[PDB]
């Protein structure tokens, strides 16, 4: 039993990138053929988890997995999303106590790197 995630996009990328770059930890640089996995823990006070991400000149592989507190669940399949055109967002309920894995997958890239702008949220 796992809730299907909600996923959407919004056209304003330039505004998103600007508000994000004010903080350095919110900007990831993914190297050639590299996969960055961001680990976001579940908050007991929390229920819903929200995410947003964007890239500068290029697209990037993106997926989401869920880890139990070794067992795993596929939330968002890892796919190449064009986040340089639009800001990509999404939401998911908490099916337990565990840890979320945000996969930024550059594995397919031989040469170019990727500047990522990502932000996380949660609820009560």
């Amino acid at each position: 039993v796992i809730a299907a995630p909600s996923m959407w996009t919004r056209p304003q990328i330039k505004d998103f990138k600007e508000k994000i770059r004010q903080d350095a930890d919110s900007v990831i640089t993914v190297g050639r053929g590299e996969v960055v996995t961001v680990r976001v823990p579940t908050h007991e006070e929390g229920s819903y988890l929200f995410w947003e991400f964007a890239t500068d000149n290029y697209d990037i592989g993106f997926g989401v997995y869920f880890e139990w507190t070794p067992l795993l669940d596929e939330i968002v399949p890892v796919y190449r999303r064009d986040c340089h055109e639009e800001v990509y967002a999404g939401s998911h309920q908490y099916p337990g106590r565990g840890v979320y894995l945000l996969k930024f997958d550059n594995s397919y890239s031989l040469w170019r790197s990727k500047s990522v702008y990502y932000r996380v949220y949660y609820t009560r």
């Binding site: 930890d25 190297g31 590299e34 961001v38 823990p41 949660y122």
Partner: protein, 42 residues
């Protein structure tokens, strides 16, 4: 208030102002991460 109402909310109307609006009400909370709790592979 209702988390599923916050989720259906942000889906429809999303903008930086709405994100900042919700940020203030305490409905949503921006989580900071760091060098750790983050991992790399080839």
């Amino acid at each position: 208030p209702a988390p599923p109402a916050i989720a259906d909310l942000l889906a429809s109307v999303d903008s930086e102002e709405v994100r900042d609006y919700c940020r203030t009400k305490g409905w949503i909370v921006q989580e900071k991460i760091t060098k750790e709790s983050l991992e790399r592979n080839v």
